[PDB]
Amino acid sequence: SGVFELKLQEFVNKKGLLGNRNCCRGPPCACRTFFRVCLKHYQASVSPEPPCTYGSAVTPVLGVDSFSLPNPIRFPFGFTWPGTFSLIIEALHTDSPDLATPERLISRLATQRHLTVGEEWSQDLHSSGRTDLKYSYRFVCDEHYYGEGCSVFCRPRDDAFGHFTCGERGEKVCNPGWKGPYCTEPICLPGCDEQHGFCDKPGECKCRVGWQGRYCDECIRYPGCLHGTCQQPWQCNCQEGWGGLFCNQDLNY
């Protein structure tokens, strides 16, 4: 379906000579900083607690104190992107390579967000209290997947089952000459009769029983009909100065 990409930029641990005693387990010291990210469904009040539904992630130590980065984090998303989600990202200090979050920690970000799909990166800055996180995120459809939720699968196909290319939002764009929901129906020749005509291929206009002509709107007279015309098929109605079934009977000489 799609992938939620989140890349991390500038974090700026606002720590003066004041003590951030999470660091220095055993005086200003280096705070080995790694992150934990949780994607959850939309919540009216975002809870940091981790039954994270859209999924979690724990990163290695990305840096000491305050730092910046040049890459992104990939969250595989295997169904329709809701567009609305709750993002929770925590910055944490540890002393070991361990990882996996008490307080050790540094700070917490928790917010509700609306994200439209597409390749355009959404920029944001969480600057508050004692921390300054800069970050970009987006949602990119997997290939052959389109639509506002990356839920529309499409592959260009010209064969027995169907004839179409893939549209912008993933809709089936029928190739010239074809129509219908699955682009399986051939377009009849412009002018072809609806009732007395059918089409097995995207150019012709085939006539049914009792009808003839280019557009199949011309009936067939009774076999042997000379001077006369049909209204409905197999009719032979004599015109001026003729009679009989064949209309060959002349009333002149």
Side-chain angles (χ1 to χ4, degrees), residues 1-24 26-95 97 99-100 102 104-251:
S1 177
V3 171
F4 182 90
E5 290 182 347
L6 169 65
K7 64 178 180 183
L8 293 188
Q9 316 153 338
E10 303 182 357
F11 161 65
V12 193
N13 193 330
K14 293 179 180 177
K15 168 184 52 186
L17 299 168
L18 305 176
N20 285 22
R21 32 194 178 270
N22 310 333
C23 337
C24 271
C29 19
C31 303
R32 311 264 310 287
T33 303
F34 87 108
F35 298 88
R36 169 185 166 273
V37 170
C38 257
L39 295 175
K40 305 181 62 178
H41 53 282
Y42 185 88
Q43 294 186 323
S45 182
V46 177
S47 65
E49 204 156 344
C52 309
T53 65
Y54 294 163
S56 62
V58 281
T59 64
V61 173
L62 292 190
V64 284
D65 295 331
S66 55
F67 57 94
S68 63
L69 302 181
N71 273 335
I73 302 179
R74 303 260 296 179
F75 285 88
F77 211 83
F79 53 91
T80 304
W81 180 246
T84 63
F85 67 98
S86 56
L87 174 60
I88 305 173
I89 164 172
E90 301 164 331
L92 299 105
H93 174 77
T94 60
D95 296 328
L99 297 182
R104 29 186 16 190
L105 195 57
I106 281 165
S107 180
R108 179 183 291 103
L109 189 170
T111 184
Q112 308 88 343
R113 287 302 154 83
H114 178 71
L115 172 64
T116 67
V117 297
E119 294 179 332
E120 185 192 31
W121 283 94
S122 300
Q123 187 74 34
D124 198 345
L125 177 73
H126 173 259
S127 177
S128 280
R130 205 152 253 197
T131 41
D132 215 286
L133 181 60
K134 185 185 177 176
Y135 62 94
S136 299
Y137 59 92
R138 63 174 183 175
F139 194 91
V140 184
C141 299
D142 295 333
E143 70 169 354
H144 306 300
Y145 276 85
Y146 320 90
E148 303 185 19
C150 297
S151 58
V152 178
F153 175 82
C154 182
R155 179 174 299 180
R157 168 198 291 262
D158 196 328
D159 39 78
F161 260 17
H163 314 273
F164 58 88
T165 69
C166 294
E168 180 182 359
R169 68 182 182 274
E171 82 286 6
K172 296 184 179 62
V173 180
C174 299
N175 302 142
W178 296 94
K179 68 166 188 176
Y182 301 95
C183 300
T184 70
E185 309 177 19
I187 298 184
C188 275
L189 178 75
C192 193
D193 201 330
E194 181 72 19
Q195 303 289 295
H196 320 301
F198 63 96
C199 298
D200 300 325
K201 79 172 178 296
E204 60 189 7
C205 162
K206 289 184 174 178
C207 303
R208 301 190 185 274
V209 180
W211 299 91
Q212 63 172 349
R214 172 179 169 88
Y215 304 103
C216 302
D217 58 326
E218 314 161 19
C219 46
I220 303 179
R221 304 179 304 174
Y222 191 96
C225 190
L226 264 179
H227 302 289
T229 177
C230 51
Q231 312 302 320
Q232 280 289 317
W234 313 120
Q235 289 184 2
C236 169
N237 309 322
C238 306
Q239 41 193 176
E240 172 197 3
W242 301 88
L245 177 69
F246 282 148
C247 297
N248 53 7
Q249 291 184 309
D250 179 36
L251 304 186

